[PDB]
Amino acid sequence: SGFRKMAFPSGKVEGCMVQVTCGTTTLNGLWLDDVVYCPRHVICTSEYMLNPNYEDLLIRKSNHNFLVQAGNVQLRVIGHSMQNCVLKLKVDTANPKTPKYKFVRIQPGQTFSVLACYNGSPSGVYQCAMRPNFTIKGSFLNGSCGSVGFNIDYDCVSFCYMHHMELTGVHAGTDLEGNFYGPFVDRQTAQAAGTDTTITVNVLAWLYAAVINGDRWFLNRFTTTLNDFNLVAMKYNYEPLTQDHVDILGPLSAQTGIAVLDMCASLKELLQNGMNGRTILGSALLEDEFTPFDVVRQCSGVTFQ
Amino acid sequence: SGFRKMAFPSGKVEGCMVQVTCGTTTLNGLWLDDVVYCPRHVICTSEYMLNPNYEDLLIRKSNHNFLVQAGNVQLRVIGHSMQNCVLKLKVDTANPKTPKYKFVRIQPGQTFSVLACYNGSPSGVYQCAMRPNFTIKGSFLNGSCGSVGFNIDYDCVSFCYMHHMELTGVHAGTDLEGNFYGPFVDRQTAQAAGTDTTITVNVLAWLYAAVINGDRWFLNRFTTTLNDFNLVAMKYNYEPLTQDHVDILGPLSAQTGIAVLDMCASLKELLQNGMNGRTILGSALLEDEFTPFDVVRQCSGVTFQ
Ligand SMILES: *C(=N)[C@H](C[C@@H]1CCCNC1=O)NC(=O)[C@H](CC1CC1)NC(=O)c1cc2cccc(Cl)c2[nH]1
Ligand SMILES: *C(=N)[C@H](C[C@@H]1CCCNC1=O)NC(=O)[C@H](CC1CC1)NC(=O)c1cc2cccc(Cl)c2[nH]1
Ligand code: NA
Ligand code: NA
């Protein structure tokens, strides 16, 4: 028992991380087979951070302006191209530690692990959710650009995020095809993150984890309907709940014998009176960065190889 | 910026994890050079979980009763011995992925990463603190015995914890020399964890992290003394504060320009009036599982290779 914010084991990703330097800018890249992926803003200078024209900047480069280092070894860049907001650097050596991988774009509410890196060197791993406003609440210092987010499916690494910038305390990036999450661009403009909301299906999954781990004080005998629940959620900036969400919570309902709409009635109450100084799984706030699948994984115990 | 519960990258440990079976019991082992380390209770059955005599149980075994599997490969056990509460299984093949390592015993208040494993397969990584009562608040299901806790110092893995049991919701284990943290034994008795307290120097480190990240609302103009502070801490089950702790917080005081005893005055106030519905770094409780070093690492950015 117990319940922690748990990240995927990162070994498979650590072996893909490299350092990419162009000019006086150094950041991280992802080396899979014979391609290094990194944020295209590595080709920027100071003059072009406000209004860059990346096609122009790229045409003025040649392969030898790109220093790519895998630990000690240097990788020879033999070609380059741009795909949306990433740069693909073709190198002379295929990474022998290339895992089985795929590139997937995630949806708001889903969680992933981030391997934070500096100078191509892994520093820390943590779990976060993609927020409804398409940012993540990460932990990133200067030089972390190119750090990746990922999930593991059995033996397969699904890369879903590459870090590009910080915007007023939160973080924005792209999928691995270079397309931004959210309405952001990789230049200096007046862009800000929109209003965030709380991910309701994740809060319910976490309340089930609490029950599984013996925290029951917030339960009550009432039931509610999707529509009466969603009527109260909207007042509190909670995402509305769909029948799809009810179905996804099925396994957890089964294992605890508490119907989803039963548990919604407890959530309704918590929204209207607060916690009154009580805690749930060691938190005094309602936690929304665990998906139903995260809970099952952690409260039933699936592994990966 | 941002602040997360961040674990060490686990690649270096993942390559040491193996599966150990004896009889109908399967759990995890740590394979370093040509020795596999695992909890000695793998030699127990049902009859001997209450009052085992491990020396007797071990003499009745031979090397071939130990099935050790590293993924697919089987490792031939060529010798065994017991060291306190661990078993050391000598195997015919030295692990080629043995990192530079050492065995260290940690103190209450210090943090480490846990690589939770099942059947020798890594499942998740998370950060936790050794509590003042010598337990950890982990997340572990049946079969996680032998999972290890570790820190990384540059290129060197310091193993500090091997998981042995769950005791009423929390977790207890040994160092890698087989000596228990805390007054626990690896048998079924009436043992329970003693009273826990809050790790004050860690709370102060976290308040500094908050300031570094722009949360300043709890600061005030007052100062206090070690003795007046510790007088209030004791009422709230906070560990007393020493001059050693003040010195360790030095770097953080320097970087924020807030003296330690200054920050203690803010903590005093928070203890006496609570948060009044406000949050600090996204928490509504005072967090004590980040050490001063964790904060510096995360709010300044040291890496490892
Ligand atoms: C990538 N290496 C770097 C990481 C940033 C730096 C700030 C703290 N954390 C991070 O995630 N980001 C970077 O170079 C981008 C590049 C953009 C495309 C032009 N810029 C920023 O994220 C950035 C710069 C500044 C300056 C002042 C205030 C803020 Cl919020 C900034 N964000
Ligand atoms: C090791 N594989 C296993 C892991 C435990 C199982 C319970 C949930 N989480 C864990 O960490 N633990 C194990 O075999 C030990 C062995 C001891 C030395 C004899 N036992 C327990 O941790 C255990 C068994 C039970 C039964 C009922 C209640 C509790 Cl708290 C128990 N703890
Ligand atoms: Na109810
Ligand atoms: Na003060």
Side-chain angles (χ1 to χ4, degrees):
Chain A
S1 75
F3 204 73
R4 285 281 190 180
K5 223 150 220 341
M6 165 177 312
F8 285 100
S10 60
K12 279 177 173 78
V13 178
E14 288 166 52
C16 305
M17 288 322 292
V18 299
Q19 183 189 243
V20 185
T21 305
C22 178
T24 68
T25 291
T26 296
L27 47 60
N28 306 279
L30 183 67
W31 176 26
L32 300 166
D33 304 309
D34 61 346
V35 177
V36 173
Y37 302 80
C38 70
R40 70 179 179 176
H41 72 234
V42 68
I43 67 173
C44 268
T45 54
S46 291
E47 295 72 19
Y48 296 106
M49 78 158 343
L50 188 98
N51 184 57
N53 178 314
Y54 286 99
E55 298 83 33
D56 270 348
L57 291 167
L58 191 54
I59 209 56
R60 313 177 181 165
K61 310 254 145 193
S62 40
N63 292 340
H64 61 93
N65 319 117
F66 293 105
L67 196 53
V68 178
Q69 299 184 252
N72 281 328
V73 186
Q74 306 204 3
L75 294 175
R76 179 161 110 271
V77 178
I78 65 156
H80 59 267
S81 67
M82 189 171 98
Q83 204 189 254
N84 302 314
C85 301
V86 292
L87 195 52
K88 301 167 69 180
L89 298 176
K90 194 80 123 34
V91 291
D92 55 335
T93 311
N95 179 7
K97 309 183 262 213
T98 303
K100 179 127 136 186
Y101 69 86
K102 58 207 187 114
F103 294 170
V104 311
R105 187 176 173 93
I106 60 163
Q107 298 279 347
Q110 317 197 285
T111 55
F112 55 97
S113 295
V114 166
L115 179 66
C117 294
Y118 303 85
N119 296 120
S121 275
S123 163
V125 64
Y126 56 87
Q127 187 84 350
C128 61
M130 166 64 68
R131 304 304 305 173
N133 67 0
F134 289 104
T135 63
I136 62 163
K137 295 167 346 210
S139 171
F140 286 120
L141 303 173
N142 284 285
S144 62
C145 289
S147 295
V148 302
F150 63 99
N151 285 287
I152 280 159
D153 274 278
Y154 306 97
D155 69 335
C156 180
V157 180
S158 299
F159 295 102
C160 55
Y161 176 84
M162 180 168 248
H163 182 51
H164 287 243
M165 49 200 43
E166 175 167 317
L167 290 170
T168 78
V170 297
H171 298 107
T174 66
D175 62 25
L176 269 293
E177 315 286 358
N179 295 304
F180 256 94
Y181 290 101
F184 309 113
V185 295
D186 49 350
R187 45 195 193 242
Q188 283 278 41
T189 70
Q191 50 189 343
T195 284
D196 206 16
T197 53
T198 302
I199 308 151
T200 309
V201 61
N202 288 0
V203 177
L204 293 165
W206 179 72
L207 290 176
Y208 278 106
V211 172
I212 295 174
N213 279 275
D215 259 334
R216 303 177 60 88
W217 65 260
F218 51 85
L219 294 173
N220 57 35
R221 68 182 193 301
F222 318 112
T223 291
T224 185
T225 62
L226 269 186
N227 292 105
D228 285 304
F229 178 80
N230 288 339
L231 263 264
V232 173
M234 249 88 79
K235 290 233 218 177
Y236 292 92
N237 241 34
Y238 271 57
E239 296 275 281
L241 210 62
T242 76
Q243 183 60 39
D244 306 357
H245 292 149
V246 172
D247 295 333
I248 271 294
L249 293 171
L252 293 179
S253 207
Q255 169 172 15
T256 64
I258 295 165
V260 177
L261 281 316
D262 212 316
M263 180 71 67
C264 289
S266 303
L267 183 47
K268 198 152 106 67
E269 274 296 307
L270 287 171
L271 293 184
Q272 300 180 318
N273 325 302
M275 329 270 282
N276 310 146
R278 311 167 94 161
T279 51
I280 301 176
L281 286 170
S283 168
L285 299 173
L286 294 169
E287 167 78 60
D288 73 346
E289 298 211 345
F290 297 93
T291 68
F293 166 94
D294 292 340
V295 172
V296 164
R297 198 168 35 99
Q298 181 166 173
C299 299
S300 289
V302 217
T303 47
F304 322 92
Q305 185 160 333
Chain B
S1 75
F3 204 73
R4 285 281 190 180
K5 223 150 220 341
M6 165 177 312
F8 285 100
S10 60
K12 279 177 173 78
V13 178
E14 288 166 52
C16 305
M17 288 322 292
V18 299
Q19 183 189 243
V20 185
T21 305
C22 178
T24 68
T25 291
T26 296
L27 47 60
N28 306 279
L30 183 67
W31 176 26
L32 300 166
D33 304 309
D34 61 346
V35 177
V36 173
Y37 302 80
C38 70
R40 70 179 179 176
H41 72 234
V42 68
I43 67 173
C44 268
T45 54
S46 291
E47 295 72 19
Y48 296 106
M49 78 158 343
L50 188 98
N51 184 57
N53 178 314
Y54 286 99
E55 298 83 33
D56 270 348
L57 291 167
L58 191 54
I59 209 56
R60 313 177 181 165
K61 310 254 145 193
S62 40
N63 292 340
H64 61 93
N65 319 117
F66 293 105
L67 196 53
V68 178
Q69 299 184 252
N72 281 328
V73 186
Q74 306 204 3
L75 293 175
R76 179 161 110 271
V77 178
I78 65 156
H80 59 267
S81 67
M82 189 171 98
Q83 204 189 254
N84 302 314
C85 301
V86 292
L87 195 52
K88 301 167 69 180
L89 298 176
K90 194 80 123 34
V91 291
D92 55 335
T93 311
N95 179 7
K97 309 183 262 213
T98 303
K100 179 127 136 186
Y101 69 86
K102 58 207 187 114
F103 294 170
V104 311
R105 187 176 173 93
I106 60 163
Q107 298 279 347
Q110 317 197 285
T111 55
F112 55 97
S113 295
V114 166
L115 179 66
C117 294
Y118 303 85
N119 296 120
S121 275
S123 163
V125 64
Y126 56 87
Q127 187 84 350
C128 61
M130 166 64 68
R131 304 304 305 173
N133 67 0
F134 289 104
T135 63
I136 62 163
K137 295 167 346 210
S139 171
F140 286 120
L141 303 173
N142 284 285
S144 62
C145 289
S147 295
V148 302
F150 63 99
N151 285 287
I152 280 159
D153 274 278
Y154 306 97
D155 69 335
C156 180
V157 180
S158 299
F159 295 102
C160 55
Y161 176 84
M162 180 168 248
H163 182 51
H164 287 243
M165 49 200 43
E166 175 167 317
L167 290 170
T168 78
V170 297
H171 298 107
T174 66
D175 62 25
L176 269 293
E177 315 286 358
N179 295 304
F180 256 94
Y181 290 101
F184 309 113
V185 295
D186 49 350
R187 45 195 193 242
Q188 283 278 41
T189 70
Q191 50 189 343
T195 284
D196 206 16
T197 53
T198 302
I199 308 151
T200 309
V201 61
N202 288 0
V203 177
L204 293 165
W206 179 72
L207 290 176
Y208 278 106
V211 172
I212 295 174
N213 279 275
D215 259 334
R216 303 177 60 88
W217 65 260
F218 51 85
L219 294 173
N220 57 35
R221 68 182 193 301
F222 318 112
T223 291
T224 185
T225 62
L226 269 186
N227 292 105
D228 285 304
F229 178 80
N230 288 339
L231 263 264
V232 173
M234 249 88 79
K235 290 233 218 177
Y236 292 92
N237 241 34
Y238 271 57
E239 296 275 281
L241 210 62
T242 76
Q243 183 60 39
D244 306 357
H245 292 149
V246 172
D247 295 333
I248 271 294
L249 293 171
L252 293 179
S253 207
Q255 169 172 15
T256 64
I258 295 165
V260 177
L261 281 316
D262 212 316
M263 180 71 67
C264 289
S266 303
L267 183 47
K268 198 152 106 67
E269 274 296 307
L270 287 171
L271 293 184
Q272 300 180 318
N273 325 302
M275 329 270 282
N276 310 146
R278 311 167 94 161
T279 51
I280 301 176
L281 286 170
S283 168
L285 299 173
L286 294 169
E287 167 78 60
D288 73 346
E289 298 211 345
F290 297 93
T291 68
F293 166 94
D294 292 340
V295 172
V296 164
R297 198 168 35 99
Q298 181 166 173
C299 299
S300 289
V302 217
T303 47
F304 322 92
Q305 185 160 333

